[PDB]
């Protein structure tokens with residue numbers, strides 16, 4: 001259908017525009033769709049873009065409004081005092097403000113559907129809420145509506161929620177348009193999605209993006225595909241990957257780099273209310289925090305991630321056990337058998353399960369996939385699925401058998417409940433991945449694994465050396481391989497922190513010289529330098545000119561291939577804020593070749609200082625543009641949990657940054 005009203009180029013300068021005469025007598029029936037293309041690059045704290053209200057004395061609570069906050073939150077109110085209805089639906093982090101310094105045209109579609117009693121909001125091609133109610137309130141069936149307003153809501157004759165921005169186009173339809181019709185509405189998005197709800201991963205949520213540019217020119221990305229809301233482990237999380245062969249313009253359908261199958265891959269709408277939002281999948285194994293590097297010698301791509309056994313995450317991992325037993329000077333994965341109070345088993349050469357109390361092999365072996373065999377026969381467990389049908393989270397058997405894995409809850413043989421690091425490789429640049437192998441312990445038999453720093457590993461330019469940064473209590477622990485990742489050693493670097501989340505990323509400033517930038521607890525990003533390809537590390541220094549919160553945020557970092565202002569350049573990606581994860585910036589630093597000091601010269605605002613920006617990935621694309629894949633929301637805030645399609649990708653040129 002065509003609209004019943006269509007108008008455009010409305011400037012909202014803290015003064016509402018009355019469109020009652022044009023719209024009110026066109027509204028008919030109980031279903032409506034609002035389509036609005038608008039900009040707001042300097043919004044007020046709380047502002048209404050569109051209102052239908054009863055403006056008369058005594059009816060201040062009879063109105064419909066589409067509103068936004070300077071946080072990027074979008075929502076609606078639908079209120080009628082006589083009916084005793086006060087609906088408020090919203091989602092944080094739904095909007096763009098500016099891109100390349102230009103105000104972004106957001107495309108909003110609100111569907112009010114009387115037949116299905118459902119209100120659905122889309123912004124920029126993304127469904128941000130869909131709410132069904134028992135008692136439906138048609139937006140123009142509000143008692144005594146007599147005003148249609150842009151840039152405010154008229155309540156008792158006064159302008160409430162005054163807006164600053166512009167509405168370039170607005171249309172209203174006397175129909176609830178289908179999800180299919182919605183998908184045909186043209187968009188003006190400044191971003192793309194690589195991973196998204198409903199894709200091959202079937203995860204509704206994503207966190208912890210990475211990006212890495214391969215020698216062939218392919219750009220590879222990995223991510224946590226998070227099933228149980230956006231929660232860290234314990235949960236169900238797999239590691240997914242996607243690549244682009246055209247400088248980031250298009251991306252492949254994701255595949256898994258690391259996955260467990262003890263729980264179903266389910267696309268679930270995780271509850272966001274204050275009673276249930278902390279619901280967490282509690283019996284699934286998971287992967288979390290991935291990192292990528294490419295090896296020049298073998299040509300292999302290598303991906304590491306943390307591995308968590310069923311029900312385990314950082315919060316409850318055994319901090320005094322590596323999960324391995326030391327023997328002769330070798331490390332072997334420990335196992336506990338069904339019924340034993342003790343871990344009386346180890347996994348030896350060729351995956352042979354060996355009894356430590358009897359010093360005697362068993363008829364059990366562990367295959368490459370960490371699956372349990374008895375005399376060559378594959379053992380199985382029944383898979384779980386999750387639901388909130390009952391009114392709370394339930395995890396229950398679903399009738400399907402999957403291979404029995406030592407990382408599962410239901411396994412006959414179970415690993416130590418602590419964190420591990422695993423590695424997988426690809427021989428075809430991300431088209432398929434090998435089965436992962438656990439890395440050995442590096443800090444002794446009685447120390448839990450270090451935690452992988454998400455993002456990129458570092459391939460040194462003048463050699464075959466590969467380095468993945470990791471962190472633990474009191475240090476960064478660099479993992480170093482000179483043989484294509486077949487064997488690893490550690491290089492420990494003390495930091496003045498107990499128990500920091502010291503997520504670190506590295507750049508090679510020049511041959512043999514590595515600077516590592518890392519998250520701290522001081523509100524400042526720190527760094528340290530190695531001049532012997534990672535063997536030894538300097539004291540810690542701090543960057544002035546960028547602020548982080550007390551708890552900090554991952555920082556991504558690259559060494560740019562081209563000179564800027566005649567100098568070698570490093571680019572950092574981080575929120576710049578001491579309040580929350582917002583105010584995303586790329587900060588361009590020029591290197592002083594006298595002393596390798598860095599002058600942070602340009603700060604590029606990714607979007608508004610008040611709009612969300614958390615973990616991020618940056619890479620120089622083969623054409624010397626910059627690709628950024630980032631969490632466009634506050635991933636710390638307990639108000640912005642479980643948002644879909646907030647990890648987004650943009651393309652920038654250096655001239656945009658300067």
Ligand SMILES: O=S(=O)(O)[C@]1(CNC2CCCCC2)C[C@@H](O)[C@@H](O)C1
Nearest residue numbers: 212213456459558561619620621622
């Ligand atoms: O110099 S590398 O460390 O091999 C790397 C890629 N360099 C090319 C050089 C040519 C332009 C595109 C990027 C930078 C890291 O951020 C990874 O993307 C890998």
